[PDB]
Design a protein around this ligand. Structure first.
Ligand SMILES: CCCCCCCCCCCCCCCC(=O)O
Ligand SMILES: CCCCCCCCCCCCCCCC(=O)O
Ligand SMILES: CCCCCCCCCCCCCCCC(=O)O
Ligand SMILES: CCCCCCCCCCCCCCCC(=O)O
Ligand SMILES: CCCCCCCCCCCCCCCC(=O)O
Ligand SMILES: CCCCCCCCCCCCCCCC(=O)O
Ligand SMILES: CCCCCCCCCCCCCCCC(=O)O
Length: 581
């Protein structure tokens, strides 16, 4: 490996290389025009080829950080456009790179991306495919600077396929749109997840992170052994640390290494790991990261022997507390891939707590004798919540279910913005659709996956615009209590009903024209406001008032002279309803 670029150019291949150089440059110099980045990419790619032909060529020996930072610094409009960022160019390489990560803006001053009409895209996709997709890769990159390049390039490829496929179907829109919607949600899910771990790591430090990783790695590699798990948990923690920092190169290298490791010692980690290991450089770590839980050895002891029924428990504990507890997690985790990771941590913490008290008491072994009895309620709590909510989501579909929640949460935290309460209840409803379709054994892990982001998103908003100490409490609690905290919120009997507003419960015929999506959001916002106005109304009373409305919109969007039925019949409703409630 005389040349670093030549070597990466080779593993990566021209197509992927160019794409990644584009993303890398876009995530840094986020305010430079596309045509400019394209020039850079062609320069670097030309240089890289030069080195593939002669590893001895000028500058081919330099590092990726030196070449990258060197290219960034050549931009003549740097100072004028970026300013301070241009002062990094004065520093020595070591510090230069670090200076750039500092001025790497997360969430810049750029306009939201409006999605064109399927036919304009498709036509753009035909007359000129590379620059169509490159310009958009560029637009997405500059807006998500901390989004792991490769994982972004992965989505890019999926977008290209949607166009290749759909842009050749009689009814493109009916094809394309549903795909552009799924990918967007996935990209948005992916992004929130990444931001969410760098948050956890930062807030709760390495210990909790490691605890989290142990439980997760064990559920997936049950056949693996604690020594291997800890190994990976350590390397994994280094990786996340480095990737969160935002240094793509270091982060990439670290991931490539970790991937090679897992694959070589594959037989020692998991059986469901061949595919990923046969895949090319770029998709290896990504593949492994999404891997499925291996089947757990069918011959495995009872935690009660090595953790409860034993003596010398406190000795093994006091000898190396965290390692012992990590052993409890690894043991309990590989036996329960049907538990959420935080439920596992919830158990480890309960265990740690009794050990601390019992190992200090007269007859230890007897003090912590009935420890698993304490685990019981901690497990059924999330189990019942899931049973409860899926038993419900079944009867009244996604929309109606979205409405039951709306009523539920609006009543718990009325001070929240109506459009916010709609967004959350809307998301939570989709979680029900996504997860309730799974058998009991895969539900808890599913809910946790989705809720975790929703709950974090939820908390970020409250941060900027506080509204309730209660929400703040749950938001600033341990990630292990976060959800159960929210689940504990009660009806706000302090809240003072908001003033009746005729304008608020006044609807026109436009609703008949709007899309199912808009019709819903419209009626949904009305429901929130209805609860905000008469919060002490029964679920029965609310149903009645909601049925009259169902009829109202119908008997009005199917009526001669549409706008009077909405003005005349509406007046009646609001009048009847006021009296009913
Ligand atoms: C002029 C120098 C530019 C530097 C070249 C662009 C950086 C591309 C290197 C990224 C390689 C990523 C390898 C995949 C790692 C993984 O498995 O996650
Ligand atoms: C990489 C190329 C990506 C092209 C996709 C652009 C169209 C998507 C618009 C964004 C959206 O739908 O929200
Ligand atoms: C839970 C993730 C399990 C796979 C860990 C290995 C992935 C390394 C790439 C980040
Ligand atoms: C290989 C060693 C990994 C370390 C494992 C540590 C086990 C600790 C288990 C307690 C749960 C940690 C939850 C963090 C939230 C909190 O601080 O209460
Ligand atoms: C699933 C249905 C989706 C509806 C969302 C409201 C239910 C939330 C309760 C699920 C419990 C989450 C399990 C994770 C944990 O152990 O905290
Ligand atoms: C901008 C601030 C947002 C505040 C909105 C608070 C709405 C409550 C969200 C609760 C979701 C957590 C799921 C708990 C499930 C349960 O009810 O048990
Ligand atoms: C004071 C009373 C005001 C009464 C105004 C009636 C507003 C009710 C709007 C709720 C919307 C119901 C959506 C449910 C559905 O789609 O069937």
């Amino acid at each position: 490996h005389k040349s670093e670029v030549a070597h990466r150019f080779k593993d990566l291949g021209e197509e992927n290389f160019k794409a990644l150089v584009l993303i890398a440059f876009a995530q840094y110099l986020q305010q430079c025009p596309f045509e400019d980045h394209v020039k850079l990419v062609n320069e670097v790619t030309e240089f890289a080829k030069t080195c593939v032909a002669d590893e001895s060529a000028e500058n081919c020996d330099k590092s990726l950080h030196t070449l990258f930072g060197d290219k960034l610094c050549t931009v003549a409009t740097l100072r004028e456009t970026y300013g301070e960022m241009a002062d990094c160019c004065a520093k020595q390489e070591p510090e230069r790179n670090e200076c750039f990560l500092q001025h790497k803006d997360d969430n810049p001053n750029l306009p939201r991306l409006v999605r064109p009409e399927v036919d304009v895209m498709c036509t753009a996709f035909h007359d000129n495919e590379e620059t169509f997709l490159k310009k958009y890769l560029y637009e997405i990159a500059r807006r998500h600077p901390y989004f792991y390049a490769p994982e972004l390039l992965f989505f890019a490829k999926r977008y290209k396929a949607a166009f290749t496929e759909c842009c050749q179907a009689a009814d493109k829109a009916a094809c394309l749109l549903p795909k552009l919607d799924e990918l967007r949600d996935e990209g948005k899910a992916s992004s929130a997840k990444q931001r969410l771990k760098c948050a956890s790591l930062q807030k709760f430090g390495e210990r909790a992170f490691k605890a989290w990783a142990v439980a997760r790695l064990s559920q997936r590699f049950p056949k693996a052994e604690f020594a291997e798990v800890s190994k990976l948990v350590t390397d994994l923690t280094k990786v996340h640390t480095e990737c969160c920092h935002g240094d793509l190169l270091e982060c990439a290298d670290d991931r490539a290494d970790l991937a090679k490791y897992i694959c070589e010692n594959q037989d020692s980690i998991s059986s469901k790991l061949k595919e990923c290991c046969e895949k090319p450089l770029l998709e290896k770590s990504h593949c492994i990261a999404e891997v499925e839980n291996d089947e757990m050895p069918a011959d495995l002891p009872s935690l009660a022997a090595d953790f409860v029924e034993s003596k010398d428990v406190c000795k093994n504990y006091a000898e190396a507390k965290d390692v012992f507890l990590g052993m409890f997690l690894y043991e309990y985790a590989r036996r329960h891939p049907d538990y959420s990771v935080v439920l596992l941590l919830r158990l480890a913490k309960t265990y740690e707590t009794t050990l601390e008290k019992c190992c200090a008491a007269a007859d230890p072994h007897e003090c912590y004798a009935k420890v698993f009895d304490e685990f019981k309620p901690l497990v059924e709590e999330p189990q019942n919540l899931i049973k409860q909510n899926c038993e419900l989501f079944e009867q009244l579909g996604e929309y109606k279910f979205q409405n039951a929640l709306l009523v539920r949460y609006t009543k718990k935290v009325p001070q929240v913005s109506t459009p916010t309460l709609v967004e959350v209840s809307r998301n939570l409803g989709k979680v029900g659709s996504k997860c309730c379709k799974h058998p009991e054994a895969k539900r808890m892990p599913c809910a946790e996956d989705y809720l975790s982001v929703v709950l974090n998103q939820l908390c970020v908003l409250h941060e900027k615009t506080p509204v309730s100490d209660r929400v703040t409490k749950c938001c600033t609690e341990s990630l292990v209590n976060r959800r159960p905290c929210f689940s504990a919120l009660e009806v706000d009997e302090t809240y003072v009903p908001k003033e009746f507003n005729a304008e608020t419960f006044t609807f026109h015929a436009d609703i008949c024209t709007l899309s199912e999506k808009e019709r819903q959001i419209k009626k949904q916002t009305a429901l929130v406001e209805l609860v905000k106005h008469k919060p002490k109304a029964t679920k029965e009373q609310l149903k009645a008032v909601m049925d009259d409305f169902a009829a109202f919109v119908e008997k009005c969007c199917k009526a001669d002279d549409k706008e009077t039925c909405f003005a005349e019949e509406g007046k009646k409703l609001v009048a009847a309803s006021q009296a009913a409630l």
